[PDB]
Design a binder for this molecule. Sequence first.
Ligand SMILES: [Zn+2]
Ligand SMILES: [Zn+2]
Length: 185
Amino acid sequence: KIHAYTEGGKPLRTIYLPKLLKKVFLDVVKPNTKKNLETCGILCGKLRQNAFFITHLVIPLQEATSDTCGTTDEASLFEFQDKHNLLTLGWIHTHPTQTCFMSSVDLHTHCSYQLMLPEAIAIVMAPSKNTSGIFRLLDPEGLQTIVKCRKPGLAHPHEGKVYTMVAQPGHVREINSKLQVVDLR
Ligand SMILES: [Zn+2]
Ligand SMILES: [Zn+2]
């Protein structure tokens, strides 16, 4: 039905994302959003039948400013994921007030995810605009750009085309599947 490929021709397995996940994330992190504070979640799940299924939205211990969030205890996150056999399939965060895009920081953050898993996605929620989007870096070229980049500054720009929206249809398929939210904070 659908065969998806990277910019360099590599095949991308499907990620099934529960249709309710995005709203549910917003509900759970609402107290931070009210404070104009970003919140991050990890999209975790399993590989079955050559496809990935997001089963768990994991909210780690984290530090949030108005334009960054970052997990602060990677070990507790990684041990929770390993105890329950949960793969890392991508990540989701809010822009409480800004528009829907990937910031400089977002691109650097996503590069880890996508180097480990070519299918890895970044979901960005812009609740004050009622918009959202699912993104990824161009592979290889955007990944190359970000890895080579040494610029200082939280908001530094990037030369060239670096990231893109996941296409519709594409390797992400939204389905009516259940969701478990795990809050580790
Ligand atoms: Zn962001
Ligand atoms: Zn950079």
